[PDB]
Amino acid sequence: MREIVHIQAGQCGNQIGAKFWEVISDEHGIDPTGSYHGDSDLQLERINVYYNEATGNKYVPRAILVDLEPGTMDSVRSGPFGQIFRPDNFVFGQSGAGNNWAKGHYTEGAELVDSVLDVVRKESESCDCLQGFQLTHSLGGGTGSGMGTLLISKIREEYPDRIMNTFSVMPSPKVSDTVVEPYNATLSVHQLVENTDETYCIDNEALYDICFRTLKLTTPTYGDLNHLVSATMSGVTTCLRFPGQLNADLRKLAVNMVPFPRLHFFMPGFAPLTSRGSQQYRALTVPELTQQMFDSKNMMAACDPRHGRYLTVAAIFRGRMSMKEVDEQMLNVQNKNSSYFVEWIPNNVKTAVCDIPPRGLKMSATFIGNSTAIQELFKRISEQFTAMFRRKAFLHWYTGEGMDEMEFTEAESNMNDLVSEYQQYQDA
Amino acid sequence: EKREHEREVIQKAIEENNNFIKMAKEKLAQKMESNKENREAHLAAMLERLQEKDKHAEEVRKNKELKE
Ligand SMILES: CC[C@H](C)[C@H](NC(=O)[C@H]1CCCCN1C)C(=O)N(CCCCC(C)C)[C@H](C[C@@H](O)c1nc(C(=O)N[C@@H](Cc2ccc(F)cc2)C[C@H](C)C(=O)O)cs1)C(C)C
Ligand SMILES: Nc1nc2c(ncn2[C@@H]2O[C@H](COP(=O)(O)OP(=O)(O)O)[C@@H](O)[C@H]2O)c(=O)[nH]1
Ligand SMILES: [Mg+2]
Numbered sequence: 001m002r003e004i005v006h007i008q009a010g011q012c013g014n015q016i017g018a019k020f021w022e023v024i025s026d027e028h029g030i031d032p033t034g035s036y037h038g039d040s041d042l043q044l045e046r047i048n049v050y051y052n053e054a055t056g057n058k059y060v061p062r063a064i065l066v067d068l069e070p071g072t073m074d075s076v077r078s079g080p081f082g083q084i085f086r087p088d089n090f091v092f093g094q095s096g097a098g099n100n101w102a103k104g105h106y107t108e109g110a111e112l113v114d115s116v117l118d119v120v121r122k123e124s125e126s127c128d129c130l131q132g133f134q135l136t137h138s139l140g141g142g143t144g145s146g147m148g149t150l151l152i153s154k155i156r157e158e159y160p161d162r163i164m165n166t167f168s169v170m171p172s173p174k175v176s177d178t179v180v181e182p183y184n185a186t187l188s189v190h191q192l193v194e195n196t197d198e199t200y201c202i203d204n205e206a207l208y209d210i211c212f213r214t215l216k217l218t219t220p221t222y223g224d225l226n227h228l229v230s231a232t233m234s235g236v237t238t239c240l241r242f243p244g245q246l247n248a249d250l251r252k253l254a255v256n257m258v259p260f261p262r263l264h265f266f267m268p269g270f271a272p273l274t275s276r277g278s279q280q281y282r283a284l285t286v287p288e289l290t291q292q293m294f295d296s297k298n299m300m301a302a303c304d305p306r307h308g309r310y311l312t313v314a315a316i317f318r319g320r321m322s323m324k325e326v327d328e329q330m331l332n333v334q335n336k337n338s339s340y341f342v343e344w345i346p347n348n349v350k351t352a353v354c355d356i357p358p359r360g361l362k363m364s365a366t367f368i369g370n371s372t373a374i375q376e377l378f379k380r381i382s383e384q385f386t387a388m389f390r391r392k393a394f395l396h397w398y399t400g401e402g403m404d405e406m407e408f409t410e411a412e413s414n415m416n417d418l419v420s421e422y423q424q425y426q427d428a
Numbered sequence: 429e430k431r432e433h434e435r436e437v438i439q440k441a442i443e444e445n446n447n448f449i450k451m452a453k454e455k456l457a458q459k460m461e462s463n464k465e466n467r468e469a470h471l472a473a474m475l476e477r478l479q480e481k482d483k484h485a486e487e488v489r490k491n492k493e494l495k496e
Contacts, residue, residue: 102437105434106434106437106438106441107437107438107441110434110438150434153430157431400441400444401437401441402436402437402438402439402440402441402442402444403437
């Protein structure tokens with residue numbers, strides 16, 4: 001047992017979090033009641049990483065569902081896998097947060113946060129050896145961004161020596177039309193730079209473009225977006241959930257992926273890209289998985305990898321395949337494209353292979369890159385932010401909850417510093 | 429230090445909301461007082477002018493009786 005405590009906050013957080021639990025429960029042979037019905041002991045060896053074990057041989061997700069409104073969590077409770085979660089772990093208010101980071105972080109979210117922490121405390125005390133915490137949330141809304149970062153800060157105070165992991169969904173004008181999302185995102189990124197060890201940048205711009213351009217879905221839904229998020233989430237946690245060699249826990253992942261503390265924002269990738277139902281009958285070859293997982297068109301952050309250099313990379317292949325052929329293909333990628341891998345971190349690409357593929361596929365590959373190209377994502381937020389902030393536009397929604405402009409200036413500064421920091425290492 | 433700042437923000441929000449209620453209440457009190465005394469002053473002058481007509485109307489009737 002090296003236990004991870006999962007928290008999901010706000011609409012987006014609870015929606016992609018719900019889907020994560022559906023996917024990994026199916027991969028571990030857990031059904032909606034928490035009963036094991038699998039045909040392989042590999043499924044149970046490291047089940048305690050994500051599931052508590054109750055009497056009756058029942059597995060309960062180590063999952064805390066947080067929100068400031070009840071709508072999304074009634075949707076989760078009423079859903080197919082909803083009966084799996086511990087009922088006292090649903091912690092919710094009635095107010096909502098109005099897509100306002102100040103309300104989530106300082107006023108509405110303050111009132112609820114100590115009852116979330118009581119559930120986190122209970123789950124933590126029950127762990128033989130807690131690794132740390134993983135949070136799912138968006139950065140563009142109110143609850144997930146504002147209250148979610150408040151939670152990160154409180155958890156860090158109680159558990160300063162555990163790993164803090166996030167799946168942070170970045171806002172795009174292709175998906176949302178709320179004008180203040182760059183404000184909420186910039187404030188939330190300021191928090192993530194200081195208080196997380198590892199952040200997966202799931203960018204809605206990338207998710208939309210993949211669905212539109214590549215998957216040929218002319219009117220994508222959130223479900224279409226989330227199907228790519230859950231695949232990625234299944235993929236990047238494989239090393240934590242099955243035996244057992246490379247990046248097998250959160251701290252070991254961090255020591256491999258994070259050469260400087262502030263530069264802990266990752267650019268995930270996935271192959272093959274699929275839409276729901278629409279069937280992959282043809283399995284990919286090892287050469288195609290390797291070409292596709294490094295392709296710009298397969299990144300979940302809308303950044304051009306050729307515009308930066310890779311500091312560190314984790315590649316994780318799933319299914320029954322030739323380990324020899326994986327090794328050849330991985331070496332081939334870094335030898336043919338050697339100038340995109342910083343010379344000053346030797347052997348910065350590490351490779352894992354898990355024998356069990358995901359649902360509906362024989363072969364998959366998941367890419368996790370710490371590239372300096374991720375500055376393009378932050379730079380996009382910064383430009384959207386500065387356009388409004390130079391005229392103090394929409395700032396009354398934030399100052400009316402007691403914030404000062406100085407908080408905005410500091411957050412603007414820290415993110416622009418992050419950008420220049422990435423450019424520093426891109427030119428060394 | 430971050431926990432003390434979170435506290436300060438929520439107190440600022442409460443204080444500005446309370447100051448807004450206060451000023452609305454003071455500004456409305458001084459407006460209504462100012463209006464009442466202004467309107468009483470306008471009616472007082474109206475009737476004090478009508479009472480000067482009654483003093484003049486008796487001077488006219490007494491001036492008649494001083495032609496006897
Ligand atoms: C007529 C508005 C449509 C709905 C909207 N278009 C826009 O916002 C355009 C218009 C103008 C300028 C550019 N913007 C982006 C749109 O297509 N949206 C997002 C905005 C919804 C916000 C308000 C109107 C509710 C898409 C998502 C939208 O179609 C929805 N999907 C779902 C959805 O996924 N529902 C699932 C359940 C679910 C509910 C809520 C969730 F948050 C997630 C999943 C069930 C379905 C059957 C499924 O799995 O496909 C609910 S609403 C984005 C991908 C662009
Ligand atoms: N990919 C994805 N994005 C979402 C989903 N729901 C909301 N968002 C995005 O999240 C942002 C708003 O945050 P939301 O989670 O709804 O607000 P909260 O309830 O206050 O945390 C917008 O940029 C939305 O496009 C979802 O189910 N999937
Ligand atoms: Mg919402």
